[PDB]
Every structure is written in C-alpha cells, then in structure tokens.
Scaffold this active site. Structure first.
Site, PDB file in Angstrom:
ATOM      1  N   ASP A   1       8.404  16.252   2.160  1.00 40.60           N
ATOM      2  CA  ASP A   1       7.215  17.130   1.126  1.00 40.60           C
ATOM      3  C   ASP A   1       7.851  18.533   0.969  1.00 40.60           C
ATOM      4  O   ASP A   1       7.259  19.505   1.281  1.00 40.60           O
ATOM      5  CB  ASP A   1       6.080  17.134   1.845  1.00 40.60           C
ATOM      6  CG  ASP A   1       4.673  17.529   1.146  1.00 40.60           C
ATOM      7  OD1 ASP A   1       5.155  18.425   0.313  1.00 40.60           O
ATOM      8  OD2 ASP A   1       3.806  16.892   1.196  1.00 40.60           O
TER       9      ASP A   1
ATOM     10  N   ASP B   1      -0.577   7.593   7.640  1.00 34.40           N
ATOM     11  CA  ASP B   1      -1.564   6.475   7.213  1.00 34.40           C
ATOM     12  C   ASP B   1      -3.002   6.617   7.721  1.00 34.40           C
ATOM     13  O   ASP B   1      -4.108   6.215   6.938  1.00 34.40           O
ATOM     14  CB  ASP B   1      -0.931   5.246   7.985  1.00 34.40           C
ATOM     15  CG  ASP B   1       0.469   5.101   7.424  1.00 34.40           C
ATOM     16  OD1 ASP B   1       0.808   4.799   6.093  1.00 34.40           O
ATOM     17  OD2 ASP B   1       1.381   4.559   8.112  1.00 34.40           O
TER      18      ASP B   1
END
Ligand SMILES: Nc1ncnc2c1ncn2[C@@H]1O[C@H](COP(=O)(O)OP(=O)(O)O)[C@@H](O)[C@H]1O
Ligand SMILES: Nc1ncnc2c1ncn2[C@@H]1O[C@H](COP(=O)(O)OP(=O)(O)O)[C@@H](O)[C@H]1O
Ligand SMILES: [Mg+2]
Lengths: 277, 305
Positions: free
Chosen positions: B145, B172
């Site tokens: 990222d 998740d």
C-alpha cells in the site's frame, strides 16, 4: 406523507419491541411480539420527500406479496423521522452462517434443492414486478429445509454508501454485482439510481451458486479494486479446482454471462436446476 | 548497503524511549488532536504518540491472533520506517500506537504546497527504495500500500513508510474497504495475477509523478491544463491503468534522470519494470544522494513550523 398500521390487512393491536437481533448497515433489526415478529427501525430525516412518497407506493406494492419462499411482509408504519418495516421472524440461521459451518454437510443434492427454492421465490417476486436488488446469503434464511428470502427491495431506500470522494464497499457486495452495475460505481453513485434489473438479480443468484459449493465468496483473496476491474471486463472463476462437474459449472457460466440477455429468467433457471444428477 | 552514525543513535534513543512503557490501555491516553488516527498524550510516560483506532467487532480468539501478527512491528525497525510502540485492543477498537511525525503525510503537504520540487523527490525516492529493500531482505514482506498518504515526515527531517500489510487476518477481518477516485495499485495487481515488490515500485513511481506535477495523473490533463499549471467511474480509471500507456512527466521542466527514473518505475510489464537494486544504481538517485538540501528547512518553511 404518512403510513399508518391500520392500513394493513394484518390486524394489529399492540407491538412489543425486544432485544436487538444483530448489527446491520440499514436500520436496526429488533425482535418483536405481535406471534413474535421481526421489526426493522430506520430513520429518514425528511429531505427528498418525493423519494419517501415513491417509497410509500413501493411499500404498498409489498402488501400484495405472499409466497412460501418469501419472508412474510406484515406491515410498515412511517412517522417521519422514524420508519419501521415489520416482517415475519425467521427461525434458524442465515445461509451465510450455514455454509460457513464445518459441522454441516452440503451435498450436491442439498445445494440443488436450496438453489431451487431461492429461484422459486425470486421468480414470484419478478412476476409481481419486484426486484430484490440485494440478493445474498445473509438475506436468505435456512431452518432444516425451510428456505425464505428476506429484505427484498430495501436497497433502493437504503443509503448504505453515504467519506469525501471515497465510496464504502462491504466485503461481499461487489462479487454479487453484475458487470453492468460494477462499471457504474463511483464515489458519488447512489443506490436509488443504479441500473438494477432482473438480470442483475440472476447474476446475484449465480454468486450464491458459487458460494454454495466453494463455501466462500468468489474473489475472496482479492481487494476491491481488483474485483471491480476483473468483474467489469468479464473475468469469472469456475469450480473445477474443487472437482465439480460440468453440469453445475454451466450454471455459473449462464448466470454470470457478461451480456445481460444471455442470462436466463428464473423460470428457465428452475428448469436448468431440475436436470442435475 | 545501509549504515550511519547519527542514524544508529536515534534508533537506540528510540529504544530507550521504547522501555519507558511496558503496557498500554485506553485511559493512558489524552486526545490532543485529530489528524481514524489521533495525536495523543501518554501519561505513564511523557511520549506523545500517534494512536490509530480501527473499529472492529469480532470474537476474542481472532483478536488475540491479530495481536500476535501485529507484534512483528516490534521486530522491524529502520530509519526509513516509522517506529512502533505497541498495539492493544479496547471496547471494539484496535489501537496501533506509533511515532508521531510532525509533518503529516505527503498528500497533505502536497495539498499545502503547490508542487514538490525534483530535488526533495530524489531524497524521497532513496528513502522509499531503501525502506522497501529492508523489508524484502530482512522480513520477506512487501508493503502492499505505497501511496503519498502513507509516507510521513517530521521537522527533524526524516521520512518513513507506514501502514503496510503485516497482518493477513487484520486485512480480512475488516468488514468494509474504501475505494475512491485515485488508485495507486499496479496493473498486475488489478488483474489478479502474481505480484511482488514490483507493484510497490509502480506505486512509488505514480506517486512521484503526482507530487511532481500536482495532480493525480490518470487521466492525463489536456494541453491547456498543463499550460495553466505552469466525472469518471471507478472502472474507467482502472481499465485506463491496465490498458492505456502509463503517465509520463513533461519533458521541459524536469531532468532526464528524473524522467527516466519514473519511466522505469511505471513500465507495465513487471519483469521489465526496474527492481529495487536497479533503482539503487540509477543515475537519478546517485545524483540526488550527493546533494545538499535542507529538507527540514524546506518542510518547516512551506508548512509553518
Ligand atoms: N426475519 C428475520 N429473522 C431473524 N433475523 C433477521 C430477520 N431479518 C433480519 N435479521 C437479522 O438482522 C440483522 C440485520 O440484517 P440485514 O439488515 O439483512 O443486514 P445484513 O444483510 O448486512 O445482515 C442480521 O443479523 C439478520 O440476521
Ligand atoms: N504517524 C503519523 N504521524 C502523523 N500523521 C499521521 C500518522 N499516521 C497517520 N497520519 C495521518 O492520517 C491520515 C491518513 O489516514 P490513514 O488512517 O493513515 O489511512 P490513509 O493513509 O490510507 O489515508 C493522514 O492525514 C496523516 O496525516
Ligand atoms: Mg438484508
């Protein structure tokens, strides 16, 4: 401008509100007593008051619905800023929880049958001219063979998307959206004016058919942006990697078809599901 | 490749401030300001930190696994990566406590300044490359990222990477993601194929052009918008990234070394895209490294400290 509860065919004398059933993006969903019942309290300010009138007529549309595979819509009262949608309470747990339960076998026959029930209910809703707009496993309830569809139509009035220049995606949402819809998404896109259709609902069922056999959503690995691009250009998984046959993979191939007109109606889909081994 | 005296000092000086607390909990902290991430005052110890809170509703067993994954941050430490103090759970929010950077993120500084000049962006390139090299060589981890909002600066003049994906479960366990109008994802990642640090290199290149020219460069501005400087759906942008030629810097106002550097970062084929070692040897960074620029002075004078 208001919706009273004596407008409704279910005779209503008193309504007890109990504990919260669960967290959810659209309103709160409490246990209730009428028999016991499920009450969903939502709040709308009053702006776009022509939208609530349109909402009112779609609700009165719901009044004419009754079908064994469709949760029983029992009533709605609107005293703005407060709204309440009252449906029958579903015993059991949601299909999302069932298929993610290791202690529950889901043989091919069972999955054929669950799918067929959902198709029957959605065919009914289509016949009455009603789109679900948010078909998914969290909105289907399964209690030892009894399959009921839930929360059809709500998505239109929902407002679950609302940061500055940044649209909110929930984990399972994208993989239920047909490519027509995914190509439209934008940070100021709104649910009221998204191109939902009967074909999009069929696509969402297709996602559920994948989920029934994989016991997880498609594109589980991937991030949202990857999912948007892959689904927009038409890339879709198959079930061979877990050894499923051609017959039940063609189901996905048909339901997930990139061009809307190649997707079956629910009555034709019911036919296709009848013919599995 | 990496060594220095004054840099060794402040790591350890951090590692002294490290032990100045052992445990952390909500009431230790007093809200100083909003940067969701907060500037906070710690009371057990005089350190002012940045505490980020991620709202999550999940069962205790997953939370304890989450904490064990985040504990790795106590192990990774680098002069180009923001230092970590600890991570606790409280009342539906996971807290991540880290070093407070007095300059904020490069997106918000870019917002304040008009454009960032090439010479600073050279030092930024070296720091990002060496930070990413550290994680590859020492921890076998990719960032995943890289973007301006996750490169932080301070008034001492250090620039360090944050918010990388150490915990697969935390990723998740998050219910909902936020995709907007700017995307820094590499082409290979958008198509769901195998990816490596090459995708981080793409993200760095695209970030660098954005900051150099002052606008997110997809879609490219027209002729008349480039003169003035000196309604698109998300899928249209993503498919533009995958299929159209990558953005490039204007050829007038920037050195050939800088243009070639970003060009090598934004090659769509990741096998042909420069790797970390090749970037380390590019003319642009070697030139930038041997330059006298008061980065603290540049930052403080444009921001106002
Ligand atoms: N008829 C019903 N019977 C029992 N529980 C329900 C019923 N309708 C909704 N719920 C529960 O209320 C919560 C809110 O659900 P919903 O509004 O559908 O959000 P989501 O689709 O994100 O679960 C969910 O946990 C769901 O299980
Ligand atoms: N250690 C830090 N020091 C100073 N500011 C920070 C720090 N960490 C985050 N921020 C601030 O948080 C904001 C970024 O939000 P964040 O939660 O990091 O997600 P993203 O970086 O994707 O926007 C920026 O305005 C940045 O200034
Ligand atoms: Mg629902």
């Amino acid at each position: 401008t208001s919706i009273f509860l004596q407008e409704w065919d279910i005779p209503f004398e008193q309504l007890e509100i109990g504990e919260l059933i669960g967290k959810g993006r659209f309103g709160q969903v409490y246990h209730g007593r009428w028999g016991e019942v499920a009450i969903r309290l939502i709040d709308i300010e009053r702006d776009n008051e022509d939208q609530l009138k349109a909402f009112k007529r779609e609700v009165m549309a719901y009044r004419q619905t009754r079908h064994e595979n469709v949760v029983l819509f029992m009533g709605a009262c609107m005293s703005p800023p407060h709204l309440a949608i009252i449906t029958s309470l579903c015993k059991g747990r949601t299909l999302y929880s069932v298929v993610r339960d290791a202690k529950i076998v889901l043989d091919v026959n069972k999955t054929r049958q669950i799918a067929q029930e959902i198709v029957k209910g959605m065919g009914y809703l289509h016949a009455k001219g009603i789109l679900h707009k948010d078909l998914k496993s969290k909105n289907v309830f399964y209690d030892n063979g009894k399959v009921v569809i839930t929360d059809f139509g709500l998505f239109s009035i929902s407002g679950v998307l609302q940061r500055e220049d940044k649209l909110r995606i929930q984990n399972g949402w994208l993989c239920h959206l047909a490519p027509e819809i995914i190509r439209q998404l934008s940070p100021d896109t709104e649910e009221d004016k998204l191109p939902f259709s009967k074909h999009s609902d069929v696509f969402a069922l297709g996602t559920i058919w994948y989920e029934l056999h994989a016991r997880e959503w498609p594109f589980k690995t991937q991030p949202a942006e990857a999912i948007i691009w892959q689904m927009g250009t038409g890339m879709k998984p198959n079930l061979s990697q877990i050894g499923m046959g051609k017959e039940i993979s063609d189901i996905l191939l048909f339901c997930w078809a990139f061009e809307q007109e190649e997707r079956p109606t629910f009555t034709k889909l019911m036919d296709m599901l009848e013919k599995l081994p | 490749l990496e060594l220095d005296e004054q840099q060794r000092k402040r790591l350890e000086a951090f590692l002294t401030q490290k032990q100045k607390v052992g445990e952390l909990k909500d009431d230790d902290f007093e809200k100083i300001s909003e940067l969701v991430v907060f500037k906070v005052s710690h009371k057990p110890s005089g350190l002012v930190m940045a505490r980020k809170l991620i709202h999550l509703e999940i069962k205790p067993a997953i939370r304890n696994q989450i904490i064990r994954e985040l504990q790795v941050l106590h192990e990774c430490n680098s002069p180009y990566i923001v230092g970590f103090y600890g991570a606790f759970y409280s009342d539906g929010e996971i807290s991540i406590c880290m070093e407070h950077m007095d300059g904020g993120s490069l997106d918000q500084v870019l917002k304040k300044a008009g454009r960032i000049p090439e010479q600073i962006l050279g030092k930024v390139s070296i720091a990002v490359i060496k930070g990413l090299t550290y994680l590859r060589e020492k921890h076998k981890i990719m960032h995943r990222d890289v973007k301006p909002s996750n490169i932080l600066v301070n008034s001492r003049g250090e620039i360090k990477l944050c918010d990388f994906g150490v915990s697969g479960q935390l990723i998740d366990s998050m219910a909902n993601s936020f995709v907007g109008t700017r995307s820094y994802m590499s082409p290979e990642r958008l198509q769901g194929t195998h990816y490596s640090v090459q995708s981080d290199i793409w993200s760095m290149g695209l970030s660098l052009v954005e900051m150099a020219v002052g606008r997110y460069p997809i879609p490219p501005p027209d002729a008349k918008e480039l003169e003035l400087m000196f309604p698109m759906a998300i899928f249209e942008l993503l498919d533009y990234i995958v299929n159209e030629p990558p953005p490039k810097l204007p050829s007038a106002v920037f050195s050939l070394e800088f243009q070639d550097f970003v060009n090598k970062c934004l090659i769509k084929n990741p096998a042909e895209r420069a790797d970390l070692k090749q970037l380390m040897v590019h003319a642009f960074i070697k030139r930038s490294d041997a330059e006298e620029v008061d980065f603290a002075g540049w930052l403080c004078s444009t921001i106002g400290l």
